[PDB]
């Protein structure tokens, strides 16, 4: 009769991969209604807002996620990406470096994604 938070997150994940970003973000919003203390729902929605060029909305969701999970690699990484697109280069680099440190501490492996993002951000700061 009613979807669980997990059903809604799964539906949002499918819409995200399907390039339906506003629809995915709304699904994560419905998951948040059901369980508002889960940081992943906010970081997932932040990534949707990034793909929608809605940087202020993405930044707010990263901040919410960080209140719920201060160790979140993705909250720091997406926050850094947000700030990079808003030309806040020093803050972007700090958050990407923090994502690097947290990923190493948590033994996560994203390939060279985080160092590559750092190089991109430093080059953009210099080129601007």
């Amino acid at each position: 009769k009613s979807p669980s938070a997990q059903e809604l997150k799964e539906q949002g994940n499918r819409l995200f991969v399907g390039r339906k970003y506003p629809e995915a973000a709304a699904c994560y919003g419905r998951a948040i209604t059901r369980n508002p203390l889960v940081a992943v729902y906010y970081t997932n929605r932040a990534l949707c807002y990034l793909k929608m060029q809605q940087h202020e909305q993405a930044l707010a969701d990263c901040r919410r996620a960080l209140e719920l999970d201060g160790q979140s690699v993705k909250a720091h990484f997406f926050l850094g990406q947000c700030q990079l697109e808003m030309e806040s280069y020093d803050e972007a680099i700090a958050n990407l470096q923090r994502a690097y440190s947290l990923a190493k501490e948590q033994r996560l492996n994203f390939g060279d994604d985080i160092p590559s993002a750092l190089r991109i951000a430093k080059k953009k700061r210099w080129n601007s």
């Binding site: 949002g12 995915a24 997932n44 994203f110 994604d113 985080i114």
Partner: peptide, 6 residues
């Protein structure tokens, strides 16, 4: 990739 939902 890190550029993905969880």
């Amino acid at each position: 990739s890190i550029d993905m939902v969880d």
